[PDB]
Design a protein around this ligand. Structure first.
Ligand SMILES: Nc1ncnc2c1ncn2[C@@H]1O[C@H](COP(=O)(O)OP(=O)(O)OP(=O)(O)O)[C@@H](O)[C@H]1O
Ligand SMILES: Nc1ncnc2c1ncn2[C@@H]1O[C@H](COP(=O)(O)OP(=O)(O)O)[C@@H](O)[C@H]1O
Ligand SMILES: Nc1ncnc2c1ncn2[C@@H]1O[C@H](COP(=O)(O)OP(=O)(O)O)[C@@H](O)[C@H]1O
Lengths: 370, 75, 370, 370
């Protein structure tokens, strides 16, 4: 009936309406191998993608096809697309309307180009693209709630009230764990470890997710670490090397609270979210403390909820009862919300068909996508 | 020869400056608002000897009389 | 006397100072604080960290902008202390506060606490012999010579209209709303956000300011010119960049009349102006159309007044006579009128005797001032 | 003691030293490791063949030379012990560790363990009364006299670009890739490997170094020059090896600007360079593009500056011309800067007293490292 395809600069998923588990799950990164000059036989694919590239990661360099929403090449993106379709479902696009997502700050020409090629290349019957946060609170069970996206390269605070919201109220900083990966990789380089290719990035993001827990005050934690190095846990890589880090682990996500680690002339996630709350009604802000909804794939780290809670606790008065909604499945929940969205017939009455672009052109993209 | 044979590792012949080449409102149509040609002495003679007197110069939000208007004594 | 009265022209965006009789602009400067940005140990560098002036408007990526002044209201008075010390500079003042009389500007309807704190500095930390502060509107009117007057102006953050005649203040008739150029910059940035151009830094902010007072004009037709097809010729930027014209440049000041698009509700500058006219009397209203006011340096636009006059046509009845200038310096005008004001005979009674400030202070000034 | 302090310098390929007042480092001693080629049949010989200058020119039979600090990355220290020990020996400066304070620099992006080991030597084994560790490019700036400017230089096996205004530099804006001349030598011999010649040990490496700095140049049009025709001039070794070279005599920019064509993962000096410049303030960036401190002890080839200019033209915001800076010799500028450094008030506030080292050590090393 539909064609549900969750997206992401990393995590790109797919399936259909009513499906609970995304059929397609893979890193949406573009792998480019070491094409050298000497001869060779029996060939290979021009450029393997994600899982295809991860399979032979030793040559394949999974560079980023998108950059906080800045898609580098549409062609490569389509190669990802086409192969993913004819990799996972192997179904033609003329079957059902497609379902895709996006986020703001994007120049309208990108989403226009996107949908334009989506009709060009695929000739789908209808189609649709939305905002991840909508599916987030949509799958949560509220029409009034503030959430924040922390993907691989995105961050955005969305406050909603009975479905209503304001773009002025919705704030955004497209910065995420990829930056942390850079920071972590270079500080471990300072510790004495080599990091050149993209595989370095893969291993460090791996162990990064494996160790970015959240403590409270790095001063006393640092004091205890220097006092007792028992927290400095060891880990042996696929290669014989075994690193020992304790501070590094949890202090790497502290940059989310402090741009000082990178010197970004910015604000902390908590106070940024606080200002998002500040752009509201005195009554609904209380509901934001009640509807303290959390999302983002880079929020699968234990401790930060209590941190952010304590932050705003120090910010907001005592009467502001904090009620953090912390789903540990928010990553996949957007795709799931897309399926649920694909289940409500009225929404499936609302569409973006062929003739709309064929005649109307891309202005209906501005007034119809959302 | 300050240090030619002495030290063969000091810069010279460097044009580190990075050159180039010599290759170099009043919409009064409207009828919106006027201006006045400044002449501080003309306006100075305009407000020449206004002996304004401030008897009971009180402009508080006090409520005890009828009204309050200072800067009222003249010649 | 050698103790020439120190005129101080403090506004939101534009900020200056002066003296009596010395007609000509003394020293122009912006309204913020310049903090350092990076470190080193190497010699050959300037220190002090409180940098204002050529080095501030030269080393933008080395100094951050601090605006404690919020719509003419400063929160961190110590910043003003540093600012005033920069004024006290013998490259700026060459004199002492305690040796000369002082006059100063102020937008009305501001809280008394600001004035209190200000006078605390102005007398306690600096035993100034004479000081009086007033409304810039009054100074402007003194610069004009009309006993009449409905001062309509805006700095970089406050819209305001002052209806008066022969100095007669009808506070119920006078109005103001804190909005001007700061949001123009913000909205400019908003269009940049719409087209992917993040310019958030303090340096980036001044770049946007250059765009503001650089890439701007208007159009008397909002949607008649908005729904058309643009050209968007690019323009060379101070980096080496070149970006399009954008219809948005003239679309931005329409937000002053359609703030609901930015979200907050207001009425319309000219509309509140008309409301003031409505609060006046029939006879005086004719004079109100006769007595129009060219004020606010933000107003510098092509066909600006044309569009506003058209709005007047849409509002006022017939027999409306309004005319135009050949303005010289709308900005300095106020300060100039204040300088002439400072050069007056009976003007001596207008100050505040510091001894009385020692005795009672603020409250006495509040009742003595308007 | 108030004697002239020892100013030791460094270098991956050429390491220097001196005193605060020397105008010339008395020894242009390279950075290497003298060793035996085979097990010396008879005991009691030149232990480890610790040879310097003429001692290295003495014999060649059982003499295998290496590097104790590969491309700046030092691994072992026994070689360093003997090297420094030889300098301490009364054949270099005929002084002691205690007799004079010691100034020294360090290459960035290194683990603290290197600093630990070095200070352990300098205070435990030898006894420096007051030591110091600094950078290199800073000293080069002092030699050039500039305190600002986009600093750029490249050692024997280390390349680095640092944007600087008054010494200030952001660590994020600081870039460095440690790959230079040593691998160029490795590739020169690899060129001759394709040409079929003698390949057995470090002796040929020395030969190739003499070629690299002597019988080698750099052209500007590798495609043209590759398609051109020469007769390939030769050289004469102690054997008189009349060997022809050709394009391989100047195939180095395919290592400098295009090393990735050797199936490698890098970028190009100019790329990383411009990126680091782009990390700065756009307008300050533009200003500093007129003053880009160019240096490099290995970048000693004609026409390569023009190749860099071509990179500039492909990357500069066109018509903002940036011509060629052609500093021929770049070695002692750091040594000169260190001599001027210790010759001033600098070291008095910048020393590392042995006592404080005894009290803390690494704690003091890093609390005073900046
Ligand atoms: N299981 C996990 N534990 C910890 N962190 C995770 C986990 N899964 C993903 N992340 C973080 O999320 C980022 C990976 O991308 P993510 O899973 O958020 O999907 P995505 O591609 O970001 O979706 P979008 O691009 O639409 O936001 C990385 O920064 C990573 O640190
Ligand atoms: N050409 C222009 N376009 C837009 N805004 C301008 C222009 N010239 C000046 N301005 C703004 O107008 C304001 C001047 O208003 P003014 O009446 O001087 O009040 P203030 O003294 O509070 O700034 C300044 O804030 C300045 O930024
Ligand atoms: N003419 C030349 N061509 C190429 N490389 C050279 C030339 N002369 C010297 N070099 C290399 O450059 C290095 C000098 O760079 P420098 O900044 O002194 O680094 P280091 O201090 O590590 O030697 C020398 O070690 C040498 O190997």
């Amino acid at each position: 009936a539909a064609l549900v395809v969750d997206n992401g600069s990393g995590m790109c998923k797919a399936g259909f309406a009513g499906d609970d588990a995304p059929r397609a799950v893979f890193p949406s990164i573009v792998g480019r191998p070491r094409h050298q000059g000497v001869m060779v036989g029996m060939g290979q694919k021009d450029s393997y993608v994600g899982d295809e590239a991860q399979s032979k990661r030793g040559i394949l360099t999974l560079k980023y096809p998108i950059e906080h929403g800045i898609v580098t090449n549409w062609d490569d993106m389509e190669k990802i697309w086409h192969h993913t379709f004819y990799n996972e479902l192997r179904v033609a696009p003329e079957e059902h309307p497609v379902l895709l997502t996006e986020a703001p700050l994007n120049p309208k020409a990108n989403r226009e180009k996107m949908t334009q090629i989506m009709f060009e290349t695929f000739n789908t019957p209808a189609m649709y693209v939305a905002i991840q946060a909508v599916l987030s609170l949509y799958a949560s069970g509220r029409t009034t709630g503030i959430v924040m996206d922390s993907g691989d390269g995105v961050t955005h605070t969305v406050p909603i009230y009975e479905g209503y919201a304001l773009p002025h109220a919705i704030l955004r900083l497209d910065l995420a764990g990829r930056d942390l990966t850079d920071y972590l990789m270079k500080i471990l380089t300072e510790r004495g470890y080599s990091f050149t290719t993209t595989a370095e990035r893969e291993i460090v993001r791996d162990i990064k997710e494996k160790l970015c827990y959240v403590a409270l005050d790095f001063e006393q934690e640092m004091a205890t670490a220097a006092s007792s190095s028992s927290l400095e846990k060891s880990y042996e890589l696929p290669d014989g090397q075994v690193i020992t880090i304790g501070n590094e682990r949890f202090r790497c996500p502290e940059a989310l609270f402090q741009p000082s680690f990178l010197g970004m002339e910015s604000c902390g996630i908590h106070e940024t979210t606080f200002n998002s709350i500040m752009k509201c009604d005195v009554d609904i802000r209380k509901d934001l403390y009640a509807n303290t909804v959390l999302s983002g794939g880079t929020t699968m780290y234990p401790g930060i909820a209590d941190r952010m809670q304590k932050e705003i606790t120090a910010l907001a008065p005592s009467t502001m009862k904090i009620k953090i909604i912390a789903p540990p499945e928010r990553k996949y929940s957007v795709w799931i919300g897309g399926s649920i969205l694909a289940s409500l017939s009225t929404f499936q009455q609302m569409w973006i068909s062929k003739q709309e672009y064929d005649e109307s052109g891309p202005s209906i993209v501005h007034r119809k996508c959302f | 020869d300050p240090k030619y044979a002495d030290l063969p590792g000091i810069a010279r012949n460097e044009p580190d400056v990075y050159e180039t080449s010599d290759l170099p409102q009043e919409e009064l149509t409207s009828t919106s608002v006027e201006h006045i040609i400044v002449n501080p002495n003309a306006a100075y003679d305009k407000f020449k000897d206004k002996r304004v007197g401030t008897k009971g110069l009180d402009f508080s939000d006090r409520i005890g009389k009828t009204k309050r208007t200072g800067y009222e004594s003249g010649e | 006397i050698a103790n020439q009265p120190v005129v101080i022209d403090n506004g939101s965006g534009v900020i200056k100072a002066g003296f009596a009789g010395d007609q000509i602009p003394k020293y122009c400067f912006p309204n913020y604080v310049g903090r350092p940005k990076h470190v080193r140990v190497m010699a050959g560098a300037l220190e002090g960290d409180i940098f204002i002036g050529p080095k501030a408007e030269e080393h933008r990526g080395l100094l951050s902008i601090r605006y404690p002044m919020e719509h003419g209201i400063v929160k961190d008075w110590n910043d003003m202390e540093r600012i005033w010390q920069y004024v006290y500079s013998k490259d700026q003042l060459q004199t002492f506060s305690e040796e000369h009389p002082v006059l100063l500007t102020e937008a009305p309807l501001n809280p008394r606490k600001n004035r209190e704190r200000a006078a605390e500095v102005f007398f306690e930390t600096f035993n100034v012999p004479a000081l009086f502060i007033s409304m810039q509107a009054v100074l402007s009117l003194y610069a004009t010579g009309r006993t009449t007057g409905v001062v309509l102006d805006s700095g970089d953050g406050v819209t305001h209209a002052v209806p008066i005649y022969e100095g007669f203040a009808m506070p119920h008739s006078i109005m103001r709303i804190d909005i001007a150029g700061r949001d123009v910059s913000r909205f400019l940035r908003l269009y940049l956000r719409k087209e992917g151009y993040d310019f958030h830094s303090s340096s980036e902010f001044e770049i946007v300011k250059a765009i503001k007072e650089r890439a701007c004009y208007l159009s008397i037709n909002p949607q008649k010119d908005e729904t058309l097809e643009t050209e968007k010729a690019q323009y060379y930027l101070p980096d080496g960049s070149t970006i399009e014209i954008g219809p948005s440049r003239f679309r931005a000041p329409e937000l002053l009349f359609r703030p609901d698009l930015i979200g907050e509700e207001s009425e319309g500058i000219h509309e509140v102006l008309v409301f003031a006219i409505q609060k006046s009397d029939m006879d005086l209203r004719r004079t109100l159309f006769s007595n129009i006011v060219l004020s606010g340096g933000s107003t510098l636009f092509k066909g600006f007044g044309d569009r506003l006059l058209s709005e007047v046509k849409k509002l006022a009845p017939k027999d409306v006579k309004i005319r135009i200038s050949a303005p010289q310096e709308r900005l300095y005008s106020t300060w100039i009128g204040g300088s002439i004001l400072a050069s007056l005979d009976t003007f001596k009674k207008m100050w505040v005797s510091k001894k009385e400030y020692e005795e009672d202070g603020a409250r006495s000034i509040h009742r003595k001032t308007f």
